[PDB]
């Protein structure tokens, strides 16, 4: 009935069945695996039916924040004023450790394109803009090839899939900026400005790209929607703990024997995920120091927490971290944990858009303090000083990048404070 152990996902239940690119990624191969099947019927079912299926599946955002997708997409389910409506697909993929969206774009592009159509229909959108990071040039070209095939098969464009619905899919490339993954900064970049996030309100569903109603959705969130419609929300909701439903793409990187991308059920144990798919921690499980469970923006957790934690939104919130993008970064006991986190702060310092004070000045400040913590050139009173600084950034910035730079620092101080103080002790003795 209510299964209590999760994992062991079977291949028949996997959505991204060309994840590893061992089958044809073009239209013929995609149609052989079930893409673009009965898409006309799905569109004719209407926006309300599609949104109902998404709500029932319990799908949550796969971009890092995890808002319930069905409710989010329903903000667009409203009568049209004069303005057009748009779906923006977030393919920026910038979070360190996260490379799942790259695999979807280059190996299952037709899942994304069909997701744009189904999702766009549900929102009443006339077109989809797919924002892909500028470095993913070859992935963008693969996606552009797939879009052309869709136009030539009548699947998108005028009278899409013969449903009478007109839909366009545009691809817009970024130019090198992690902040452009932030949903409102992404919109500003499409409009030809610096990728600086907007304050909210207004929300994009009211005022978005070109000032029009807009929904920004992650590549993975969009790409699963046609399958959720074909196989039903109930089927998707049968995976994972309640309110943590579905399958999930996981990146396992760092100190593991076989770093890899894999699709696994939600709520799978973290330890099982590393051991079954990634070939275990380098040097064995007893060589594990810490894990960053959801990309650079999620607080690290120490080995003791990693023994029993489940990989889903609620489980990781209990561990004082978060699922994030589900990019698992493994660090074994040879890692210089202070230097590892100090490098992430240096990443956020280089990615801050500079718009708002607490992040423009605060993240740069935290970077300088962390650089001295790596060498030990500090005193223990500065640890609690660093903690308070991170709390002055968190919750005071325009966008969540400021939060994402404060959380890794807090995780380091929370779980490895003696390591910091030990290093300060070494530096004082050696210099004195």
């Amino acid at each position: 009935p209510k299964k209590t152990s999760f994992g062991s996902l079977k291949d028949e239940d996997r959505i991204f069945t060309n994840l590893y690119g061992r089958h044809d990624w073009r239209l013929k191969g995609a149609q052989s695996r079930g893409d673009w099947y009965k898409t006309k019927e799905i569109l004719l079912k209407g926006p309300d039916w599609i949104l109902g299926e998404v709500k029932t599946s319990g799908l949550r955002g796969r971009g890092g924040a995890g808002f319930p997708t069905g409710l989010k997409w329903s903000f667009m389910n409203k009568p049209s004023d004069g303005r057009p409506k748009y779906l923006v697909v977030n393919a920026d993929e910038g979070e360190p450790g996260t490379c799942k969206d790259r695999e979807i774009i280059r190996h299952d592009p037709h899942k994304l394109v069909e997701g744009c159509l189904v999702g766009g229909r549900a929102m009443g959108a006339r077109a989809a803009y797919i924002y892909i990071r500028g470095e993913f040039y070859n992935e963008a070209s693969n996606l552009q090839v797939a879009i052309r095939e869709a136009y030539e098969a009548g699947l998108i464009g005028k009278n899409a899939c013969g449903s009478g619905y007109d839909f366009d899919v545009f691809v817009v490339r970024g130019a090198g900026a992690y902040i452009c993954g932030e949903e409102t900064a992404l919109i500003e970049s499409i409009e030809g400005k610096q990728g600086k996030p907007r304050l909210k309100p207004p929300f994009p569903a009211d005022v978005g790209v070109f000032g029009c109603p807009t929904t920004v959705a992650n590549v993975e969130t969009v790409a699963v929607s046609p399958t959720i419609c074909r196989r039903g929300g109930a089927w998707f909701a049968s995976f994972g703990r309640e309110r943590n439903s579905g399958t999930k793409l996981f990146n396992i990187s760092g100190h593991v024997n076989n770093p890899c991308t894999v699709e696994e059920e939600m709520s799978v144990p973290l330890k099982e995920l590393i051991e079954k798919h990634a070939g275990g921690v380098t040097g064995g499980w007893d060589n594990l120091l810490a894990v960053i469970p959801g990309g650079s923006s999620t607080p690290l957790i120490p080995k003791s927490v990693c023994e029993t934690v489940l990989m889903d939104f609620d489980a990781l919130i209990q561990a004082q971290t978060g699922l994030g993008t589900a990019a698992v970064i493994v660090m074994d006991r040879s890692t210089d944990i202070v230097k590892a986190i100090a490098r992430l702060i240096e990443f956020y310092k280089h990615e801050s858009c500079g718009q708002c004070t607490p992040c423009r000045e605060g993240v740069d400040w935290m970077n300088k303090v962390m650089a001295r913590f790596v060498r030990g050139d500090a005193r223990p009173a500065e640890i609690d000083s660093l903690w308070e600084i991170s709390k002055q950034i968190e919750g005071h910035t325009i966008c969540a990048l400021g939060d994402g730079a404060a959380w890794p620092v807090q995780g380091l101080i929370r779980h490895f404070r003696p390591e910091l103080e030990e290093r300060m002790q070494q530096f004082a003795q050696q210099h004195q």
Binding site: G134, E135, A175, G176, G195, F210
Partner: protein, 62 residues
Amino acid sequence: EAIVKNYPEGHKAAAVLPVLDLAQRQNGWLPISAMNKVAEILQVPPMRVYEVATFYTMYNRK
């Protein structure tokens, strides 16, 4: 021309990033004259093109 037609009329400024990137593919890098040419084609103030060129790290200004 095809880049500019991907956006609503009255919002040509949306084409600054892809057109600026095209100038760099033809030329290898972006001299100040290339930034001015892009601003002229899209009819946006040149300063709004300098901001984009210096914000995004893939543009080569040397």
